[PDB]
Amino acid sequence: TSLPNYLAGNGDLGSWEPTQIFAGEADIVTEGGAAGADIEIYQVIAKNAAGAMVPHDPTATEVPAPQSVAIGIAAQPAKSGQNVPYYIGGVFNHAALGWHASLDTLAKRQAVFDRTNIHIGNLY
Amino acid sequence: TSLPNYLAGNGDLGSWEPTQIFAGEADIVTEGGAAGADIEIYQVIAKNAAGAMVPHDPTATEVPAPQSVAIGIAAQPAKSGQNVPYYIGGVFNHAALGWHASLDTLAKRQAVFDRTNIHIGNLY
Amino acid sequence: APFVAPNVQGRVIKESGYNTKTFKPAYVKPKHVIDPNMIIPRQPGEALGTGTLSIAQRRDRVIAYLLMKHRAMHENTWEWMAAQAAQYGYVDVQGQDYPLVRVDFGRDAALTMTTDWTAAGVTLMDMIADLRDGQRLVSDKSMSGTVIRDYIFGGDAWDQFVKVGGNVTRLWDDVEGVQYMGELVGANGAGRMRIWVNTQKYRDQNDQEQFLMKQKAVMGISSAIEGVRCFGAILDKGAGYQALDYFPKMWDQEDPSVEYLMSQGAPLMVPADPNASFLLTVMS
Amino acid sequence: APFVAPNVQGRVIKESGYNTKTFKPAYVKPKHVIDPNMIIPRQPGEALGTG
Amino acid sequence: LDKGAGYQALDYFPKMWDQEDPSVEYLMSQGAPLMVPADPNASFLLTVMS
Amino acid sequence: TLSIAQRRDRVIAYLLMKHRAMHENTWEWMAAQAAQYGYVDVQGQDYPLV
8 A cells, every 4th residue: 555656557447327216206205113134225125023124025924924015115224233214105216226036027016015105116 | 336325434545654665875776677577566686597587586596596696676566578677776675675585684684785786774 | 863973874764654534424314393283382481371472473482492402402412422432432323214333433442441440459549550551552552642631430430439449620610410520649640630520411312311421431531632523515405415514494384384394414523533532441 | 208198297217327547657768878988079060180 | 287387388398396305306397299290291201121 | 526516506407408308309209200100109108109
């Protein structure tokens, strides 16, 4: 870390791409709750049987387990035991969000948030 | 890079220390010639039997090989086959240079350059 | 400086470089929703039964009070952050709407000490020796070799200390929770030990009340800590995103007529030299 | 642009990023040593005999 | 079809407004275009390859 | 060197330009469809195929 470089050379300093989370104009609404697992930014979240936030996990069970019904979108990342701020309302670009496996197409990603204040849709 | 970091946090942007090459005020003299092996900055270099710059190596043989007599101090790093500019005259900081094993203490690191126009000594 | 006989050329002195460290401040968002349920009822200053001031003026009164309370909450947060930084060398910023992240300023782990003043056979000199050793470590570690003059005790630490034992400072005569216990000469040698006890209680983010200073410990500190109070950008379209200690903002919902009042700010209290202080846990 | 029935809200459009490049320059040091060996000698201009 | 521009007829109309918390801001443009060949038969299209 | 307010200003100017340009591109695309095919399929996720 000490010396300069006297010799010529090139360097690709880096690249930046915007992440657009909002895809519409509902009332954006947020809440905070304890996490039960490692949650990434804009990961879709559910609440487990103990009321702690857990990343959304459809087909968790033979009766479906409460992790299987999504409840919000993480606004900042958190480790287990920490508080997670998360969105409960708003219109969100499905592409930016973190999704479970097998929840591939937008047609499925909408089905997670029909009965809800959140709605999830495509950007143009 | 896409998302700005919103949360508070800490980061060590870096730790810097001057690498003072010179420990005296004599005439500084430099040459340049092809390298025979990968040479770091301020490494102490000999000349191998082929006449190419090779990092200094005492005890290289039942008769000492020409890699075993130091001839200069590399001014820039170079791969084999590249031209290495190197110092051949000047008073140099004991600690800044690329010595190797068994050439550990300042006494030996001086004995390598006794009569030469290069001399090696402590910074205060 | 080096001694060199005037014959010889001279002597070359080696320089030293620096670490550099960088921090992002926390973000604070208290807001009150102002129903008619809060504007209509009588509040202290109102003349009690005679209707001398309109609903508009009662609203103005309550909003002025809430702005004042917001300023107070930010100021409390600055105090809490500064206290956490001085004590621990780090601050665990938290909340419901804010995940736990530890802003470690980089106090060397040697300066977070532990000894047992509850053990049998401890003497006043052993305790003062522990404090002197804390001072020694700080002097060995600081950027400026500064000696600590001020030692701040928790309540439990001060009770243990007194149980086993037996001008600028005027700015804290009138102040609650801060107790100036004067000075002791002891066997520190390196600098006279101003003694403080701090017992202030603050409302945690669970609105449980906790002590601002770790009660079971003693903190030494010196002005060389040269802390900076840092205020980041306000991430709000109001006031042009510019960086402010706090920003009071107010907007209303059209029907039902509900006002929302929010103050927000981006505070961080950074010790310039995280090693100009130390913390010693004295209790079991 | 997206066609959108006058009733409904409209659609949100993504936008692009940036890419960056950086370069260190090279360094050049020609020099001469000018001896009396190089100055004394004649220059075609000089006349014959007594330059 | 917007209260902005007084329901006037315009090539395009740009409109901008913001939420207050979080302070996300919206920018939208309105337009009612149609490009009418008054005489559709003054042109032809000839496909020339399969 | 840009305050965050100025970063906002820059991006807003750019997006206003982008909107104007996307509208004018739609004018071009409609004119193209009219002149070539004699008909235009106006479509979208938010506009039934007409």
